[PDB]
Amino acid sequence: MTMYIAFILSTIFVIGFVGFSSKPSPIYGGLGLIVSGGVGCGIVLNFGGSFLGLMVFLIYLGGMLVVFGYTTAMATGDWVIYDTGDSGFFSEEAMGIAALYSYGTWLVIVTGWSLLIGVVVIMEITRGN
Amino acid sequence: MPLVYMNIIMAFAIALAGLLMYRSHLMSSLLCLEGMMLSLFIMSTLIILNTHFTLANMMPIILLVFAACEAALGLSLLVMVSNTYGTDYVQNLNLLQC
Amino acid sequence: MNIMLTLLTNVTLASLLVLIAFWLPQLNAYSEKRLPFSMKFFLVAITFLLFDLEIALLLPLPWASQTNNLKTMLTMALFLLILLAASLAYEWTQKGLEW
Amino acid sequence: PGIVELPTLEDLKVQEVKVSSSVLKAAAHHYGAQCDKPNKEFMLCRWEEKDPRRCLEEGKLVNQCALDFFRQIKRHCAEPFTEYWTCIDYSGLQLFRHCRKQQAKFDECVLDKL
Amino acid sequence: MNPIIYTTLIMTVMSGTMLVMISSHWLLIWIGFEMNLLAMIPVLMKNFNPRATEAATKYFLTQATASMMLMMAIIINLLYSGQWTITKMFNPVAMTMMTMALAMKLGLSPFHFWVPEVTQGISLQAGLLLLTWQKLAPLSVLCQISQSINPNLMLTMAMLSILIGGWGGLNQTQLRKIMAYSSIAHMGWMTAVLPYNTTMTILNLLIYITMTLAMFMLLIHSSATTTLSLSHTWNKMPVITSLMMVTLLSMGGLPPLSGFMPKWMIIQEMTKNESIIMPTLMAMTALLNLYFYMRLAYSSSLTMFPSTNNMKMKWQFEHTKQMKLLPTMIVLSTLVLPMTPALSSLN
Amino acid sequence: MWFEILPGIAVMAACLFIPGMATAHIHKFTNGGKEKRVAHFSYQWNLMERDRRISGVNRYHVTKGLENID
Amino acid sequence: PFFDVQKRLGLDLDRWMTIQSAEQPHKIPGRCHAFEKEWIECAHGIGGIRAEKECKIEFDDFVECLLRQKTMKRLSAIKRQRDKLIKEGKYTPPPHHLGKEDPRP
Amino acid sequence: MFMINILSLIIPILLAVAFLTLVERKVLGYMQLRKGPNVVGPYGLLQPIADALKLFTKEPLRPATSSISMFIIAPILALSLALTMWVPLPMPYPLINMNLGVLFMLAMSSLAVYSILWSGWASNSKYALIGALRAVAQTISYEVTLAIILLSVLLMNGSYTLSTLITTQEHIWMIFTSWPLAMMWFISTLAETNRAPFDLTAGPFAMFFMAEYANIIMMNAFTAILFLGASHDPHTPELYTINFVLKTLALTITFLWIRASYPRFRYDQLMHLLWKSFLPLTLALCMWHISLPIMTASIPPQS
Amino acid sequence: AGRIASFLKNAWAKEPVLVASFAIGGLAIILPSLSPYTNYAIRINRATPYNYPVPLRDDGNMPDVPSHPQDPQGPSLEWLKNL
Amino acid sequence: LFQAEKDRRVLQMLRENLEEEAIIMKDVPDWKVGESVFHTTRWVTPMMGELYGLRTNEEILSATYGFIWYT
Ligand SMILES: CCCCCCCCCCCCCCCCC[C@@H](O)O[C@H](CO[C@H](O)CCCCCCCCCCCCCCC)COP(=O)(O)OCC[N+](C)(C)C
Numbered sequence A: 001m002t003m004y005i006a007f008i009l010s011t012i013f014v015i016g017f018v019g020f021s022s023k024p025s026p027i028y029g030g031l032g033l034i035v036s037g038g039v040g041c042g043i044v045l046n047f048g049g050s051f052l053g054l055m056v057f058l059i060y061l062g063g064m065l066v067v068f069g070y071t072t073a074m075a076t077g078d079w080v081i082y083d084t085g086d087s088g089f090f091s092e093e094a095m096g097i098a099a100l101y102s103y104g105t106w107l108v109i110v111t112g113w114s115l116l117i118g119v120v121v122i123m124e125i126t127r128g129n
Numbered sequence B: 001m002p003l004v005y006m007n008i009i010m011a012f013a014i015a016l017a018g019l020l021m022y023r024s025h026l027m028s029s030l031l032c033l034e035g036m037m038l039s040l041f042i043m044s045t046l047i048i049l050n051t052h053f054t055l056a057n058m059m060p061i062i063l064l065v066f067a068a069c070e071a072a073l074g075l076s077l078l079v080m081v082s083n084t085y086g087t088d089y090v091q092n093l094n095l096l097q098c
Numbered sequence C: 001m002n003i004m005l006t007l008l009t010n011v012t013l014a015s016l017l018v019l020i021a022f023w024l025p026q027l028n029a030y031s032e033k034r035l036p037f038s039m040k041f042f043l044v045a046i047t048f049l050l051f052d053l054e055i056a057l058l059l060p061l062p063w064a065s066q067t068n069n070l071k072t073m074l075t076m077a078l079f080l081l082i083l084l085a086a087s088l089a090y091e092w093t094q095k096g097l098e099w
Numbered sequence D: 001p002g003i004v005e006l007p008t009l010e011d012l013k014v015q016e017v018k019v020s021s022s023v024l025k026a027a028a029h030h031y032g033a034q035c036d037k038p039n040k041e042f043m044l045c046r047w048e049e050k051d052p053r054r055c056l057e058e059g060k061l062v063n064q065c066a067l068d069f070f071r072q073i074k075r076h077c078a079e080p081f082t083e084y085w086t087c088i089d090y091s092g093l094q095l096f097r098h099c100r101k102q103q104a105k106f107d108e109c110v111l112d113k114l
Numbered sequence E: 001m002n003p004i005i006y007t008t009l010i011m012t013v014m015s016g017t018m019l020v021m022i023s024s025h026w027l028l029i030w031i032g033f034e035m036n037l038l039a040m041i042p043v044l045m046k047n048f049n050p051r052a053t054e055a056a057t058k059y060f061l062t063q064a065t066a067s068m069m070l071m072m073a074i075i076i077n078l079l080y081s082g083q084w085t086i087t088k089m090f091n092p093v094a095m096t097m098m099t100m101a102l103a104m105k106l107g108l109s110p111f112h113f114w115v116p117e118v119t120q121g122i123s124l125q126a127g128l129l130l131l132t133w134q135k136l137a138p139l140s141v142l143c144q145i146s147q148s149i150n151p152n153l154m155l156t157m158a159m160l161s162i163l164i165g166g167w168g169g170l171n172q173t174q175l176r177k178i179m180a181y182s183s184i185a186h187m188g189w190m191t192a193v194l195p196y197n198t199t200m201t202i203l204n205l206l207i208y209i210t211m212t213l214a215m216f217m218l219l220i221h222s223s224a225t226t227t228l229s230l231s232h233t234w235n236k237m238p239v240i241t242s243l244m245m246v247t248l249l250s251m252g253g254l255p256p257l258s259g260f261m262p263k264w265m266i267i268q269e270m271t272k273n274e275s276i277i278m279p280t281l282m283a284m285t286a287l288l289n290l291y292f293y294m295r296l297a298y299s300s301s302l303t304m305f306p307s308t309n310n311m312k313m314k315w316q317f318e319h320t321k322q323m324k325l326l327p328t329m330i331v332l333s334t335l336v337l338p339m340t341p342a343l344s345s346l347n
Numbered sequence F: 001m002w003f004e005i006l007p008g009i010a011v012m013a014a015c016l017f018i019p020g021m022a023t024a025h026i027h028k029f030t031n032g033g034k035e036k037r038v039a040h041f042s043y044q045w046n047l048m049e050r051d052r053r054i055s056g057v058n059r060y061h062v063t064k065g066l067e068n069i070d
Numbered sequence G: 001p002f003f004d005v006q007k008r009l010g011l012d013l014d015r016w017m018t019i020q021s022a023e024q025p026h027k028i029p030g031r032c033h034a035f036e037k038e039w040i041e042c043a044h045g046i047g048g049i050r051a052e053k054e055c056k057i058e059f060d061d062f063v064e065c066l067l068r069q070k071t072m073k074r075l076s077a078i079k080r081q082r083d084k085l086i087k088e089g090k091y092t093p094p095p096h097h098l099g100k101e102d103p104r105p
Numbered sequence H: 001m002f003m004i005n006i007l008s009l010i011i012p013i014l015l016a017v018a019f020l021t022l023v024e025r026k027v028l029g030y031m032q033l034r035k036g037p038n039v040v041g042p043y044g045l046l047q048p049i050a051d052a053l054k055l056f057t058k059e060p061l062r063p064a065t066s067s068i069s070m071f072i073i074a075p076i077l078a079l080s081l082a083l084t085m086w087v088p089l090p091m092p093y094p095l096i097n098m099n100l101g102v103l104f105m106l107a108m109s110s111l112a113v114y115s116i117l118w119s120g121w122a123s124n125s126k127y128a129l130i131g132a133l134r135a136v137a138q139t140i141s142y143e144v145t146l147a148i149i150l151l152s153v154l155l156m157n158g159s160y161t162l163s164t165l166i167t168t169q170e171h172i173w174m175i176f177t178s179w180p181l182a183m184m185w186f187i188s189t190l191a192e193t194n195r196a197p198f199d200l201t202a203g204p205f206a207m208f209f210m211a212e213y214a215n216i217i218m219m220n221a222f223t224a225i226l227f228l229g230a231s232h233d234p235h236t237p238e239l240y241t242i243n244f245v246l247k248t249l250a251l252t253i254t255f256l257w258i259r260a261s262y263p264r265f266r267y268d269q270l271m272h273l274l275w276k277s278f279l280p281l282t283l284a285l286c287m288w289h290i291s292l293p294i295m296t297a298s299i300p301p302q303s
Numbered sequence I: 001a002g003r004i005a006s007f008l009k010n011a012w013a014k015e016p017v018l019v020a021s022f023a024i025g026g027l028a029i030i031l032p033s034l035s036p037y038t039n040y041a042i043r044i045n046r047a048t049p050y051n052y053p054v055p056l057r058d059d060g061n062m063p064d065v066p067s068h069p070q071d072p073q074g075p076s077l078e079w080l081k082n083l
Numbered sequence J: 001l002f003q004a005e006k007d008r009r010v011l012q013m014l015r016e017n018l019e020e021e022a023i024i025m026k027d028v029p030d031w032k033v034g035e036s037v038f039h040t041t042r043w044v045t046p047m048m049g050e051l052y053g054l055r056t057n058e059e060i061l062s063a064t065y066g067f068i069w070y071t
């Protein structure tokens, strides 16, 4: 037991949320949120969620917080609850995620329509006049 | 219920409280919302992976997508508010009073 | 462990070599003597964010190709790409990609 | 709410198969061809009983069948099997496709002998 | 905006509400709420001005916070029971957080503060849509999970909503703020009967929606957003003022008007469950809503306020656009008391 | 002439030769003269764990041959 | 409120994702498949109220599988007593728990 | 011996980057009827060492008003990401064998823009901030099409594992299967690293320079692995290493050639290029490459 | 007839990228429904054994279920070898 | 063969843990050695902490994070 590494990861996550929850100098708040997102991604990756952790680290960090900082720039215990068996010759996470195209037709339809409406709504809101 | 889930929920509560404080900078409001969705993603992912709910692996991605879309909308709104005042201060939105 | 050690090594080497670069010329003594907020640049970032979300949706495609329900997955993947193209076309025709 | 029963340490003693995964992969096709009946009985009992404690004898039977299979290989086709599993062991993926020649030697040897 | 875009956004709002209403999976309910939230924002900003932008951003903030709380409640429920179906909540305060999220979505006290501001900022059509259609989905979810709710918290927030609406309506000269406080009080009346009978909640919702539609269409026809601006309507359209006064009396809960039907039934239902004090207090507090309705009626049609000279020119023109459903809405919000037992249709 | 560019390029080539080759040699030295075993999919990991236990020296690379079947 | 379109039309829009034991891809089982199966079978058609009073055993077993509070409590008690005896000095773990066992395939 | 492996990966890349500058100057000079540095050293071989020593012994001009925190952090992030993105690559065997290696590289490349943002915002100047905003917008714009092209190409590989790309191209290169995607990928990699014709924008400056040049070399190496598959024999990986290094050197020299051969775009011109020529073609070819294995019953194995 | 050809000829000039993209997308939509190898791909996906084949308990009334893998009855993969 | 070996190893580890619990809990008044926490008598797959709870830290780290940390 590496002194319950997940415990330290969770504590650092909470410390980061406390750090930018005071909201000092919103770029410093954003950087604290970047560190917190990195810590949470590390938590998910260490748990075993490689694909979902990489989704966090790519989408969240590289797109959403990047756009946040861009707009701001324009302005002024463990190891016990786990399993025993194996997964086969694949990862169950990848199979469940890829099931979105064979099982989740309804989810794909609603999410795609929502994203298209989001694009249209953004255009209308940012039209100005 | 292990301590990690409690830590994540405490993080979410801290983010929500910080959103409710409103020192200034509505951008910080959006930041608090995004911290809240990040905590939601992390804890939902941990719960789903742990119980081996294979079809539930869909849900976090969906959540992320939708939440990020919301952020975009919020950012747009912020710009227009700033586009009227030049700054994103909360107290500038005092025109409407109960 | 190995990935953590590799990241730690890379960060440590970069930090040490930056510090020595920043401190070697500091041992010798020398003289030691706005608003505009363009709106198109915001639309570029927002469009990038939306298209990145749709890419996130598209990502599980390499594993989606082994499901035995090939017709349905092909239909849904083509549907997602069609709506991505439709978003691009709508933003194009509404003068959203101009300078 | 009750006491869980576990078999004694003596009931779990069996002559174990002490060959590595490379040897097992090299012999796997003929092993499945020859040891099908005890393996199928064990797996049927395992999926129907849903209990490790109710399928202990069948594990001993499948171990015995594997040991007999390897004993026949050792008596008749030890050397070509040795080169075949050494080749399989070298590869980091343990791919069959890199030394079809050693596989052909081993397969013709076992076909001629047994 | 482009009429095609407006039609698409309205259809997206309605499709989000229908997705909430027809789905049995919590994630699909959250997705429907997200879709409705996304498509509602431009509708509030059809007329571009800083007031509408402020109202839209306030609404977006409140609704996004409510959605985050809803997701947290869903995830805690999943943690304590691996269920996604919308059923009994299966857990402690996870239900409390679900109730808080739905209360913020509906505008119940103590989360009532955003309703008057958003209603004042937006125009009359946007206010009509906001105060009528945006209540169906959260109320549907609450009706689905009604057996889970703790009666103490729900009844406390309902009584708070009634009290706050009654008191806050007394101080208003703007018509939109009056409508917002009326909505808050009516939602308070609606959610106090959820622990006992959801059919009564739905009946109150139908009656309130009819009355609100009639009131907003009458306000749009005589395009006034202020008490004094409304006081000039008699010099042009006295029949509009008379219909408005009758509708206001109906919204006050006076028998034999239609608006008396819900409260009556609700009170009746609450007496079957050995509850007396709360129905009494609710009636005595709705007296305040009646008072400010009656003040508006005094300023509208029972007295004739001074007019202006240019009004004469307005005498020579007729409304080009006519609302077809306005006559029906008035009759349904005024004269449907004798058809009360039809509530057995499980409306 | 143009071949005077070749020296520096050669240096680059040598610098780009070192990493990959090095890894291979290390993979030969740490994994007992064979290719390093890759473990995705959690079944190859089980195979490696079984190999580690059988050897008795707590190393997956050591291979127990038929000679150990008696 | 709830308009059960899926049952009227037989569409199955989102019922496939509601429970762990409903046709996972590649027949991958949930961690608590048996407990959830038992609890669902017991409570089918009984209704929520009678279901809540009468299927309490199966639901308690399902929750124990999901969160394992009792198992961790028992393990922690055993470990605490072991630590107490090993600090007092009257207990010595066998080589099996010290790393000196003979591992088996 | 994992520390030795990390060091033997990390040091030769830096040496390669130092010598790349000499090659870039030398290659360009001979392309312009002149020579590169040929005085400092036998053939300019000592020029990078003299450059490094002079840059490290030159005074650093700290803005005297900037945030020292981010001013120091930005080069750290740049170097860390540049050196980290080499870990996943298999030459033939990777330092770290990742299941989702390509996705990891995508995430790192997505992070790469924070250094630009922080350098611009800590520069304490409106004009440098405007330039940084332009650079960040261009980078995110082109990484969109990078990601789409990358997943379209990987649809024939069967996974995100980088090693499997060697097995996929054992008989034929990937360039023949899809050359248009390779063309757009090459242009997108040119535009990502702010290289001509897209180059619109003492110690820390050298740090950023080494980070950019290491990113250039890594991008060329990744392109060579992705589209020009080298045959790997398990019993002698040196042949694969030699072939991979030769192809990477050829691609880097091709970048130098393109820099030497063309004028530069305007900002709006490259924006239009991407958003109105690459994205539609990228989406169409993504649809084509989704449907193609299903039409031809040629789906890759791994799942 | 003539108007469509004129429009395509005008689009092939000064807008070739859009013409190529639309053609490729339309072909990607249309072709899979006409190819005969999509069923082959589905069958290939069906024949990939990811799980252990759990044996069936024999009752003497399954003439189509083999008792051993070498028995002739059961699904065959000769067609896949021929591919 | 792997399934049989897995079942045998898991059962043998559980037997060792039961023996150690019987030795340790001999003085605790209300303890019942090897008492199930479930009402059902059906076999339940043991957790990782049920097998490795009393064992040493290094092999706990192995069984928990070896596959995740193997690169
Ligand atoms: C009947 C109502 C029609 C009018 C009302 C429309 C209401 C809103 C529009 C959305 C409803 C469309 C119906 C789609 C429901 C999904 C379920 C159904 O389609 O079956 C699927 C069949 O998939 C079909 O391919 C669906 C194709 C239709 C979707 C493509 C276009 C959708 C656009 C609809 C509106 C979206 C926005 C507007 C775009 C113009 C499931 O596939 P299946 O293989 O059986 O089972 C998989 C499970 N397995 C693996 C265990 C076997």
Ligand SMILES: CCCCCCCC/C=C\CCCCCCCC(=O)O[C@H](COC(=O)CCCCCCC/C=C/CCCCCCCC)COP(=O)(O)OCCN
Residues within 6 Å of the ligand: C082, C085, C086, C088, C089, C092, C093, H276, H279, H280, H281, H283, H284, I008, I011, I015, I018, I019, I020, I021, I022, I023, I024, I025, I026
């Ligand atoms: C449902 C099918 C989808 C699948 C294929 C498409 C996938 C991706 C392609 C679409 C991406 C989005 C494209 C957005 C289109 C916007 C068009 C537009 O508005 O631009 C017009 C120009 O667009 C047009 O020219 C109108 C249509 C032109 C032809 C479009 C294709 C129509 C059919 C052609 C091919 C038909 C099938 C192929 C057969 C050809 C023979 C092999 C103005 O250009 P500017 O840049 O503003 O110029 C100003 C500076 N001078």
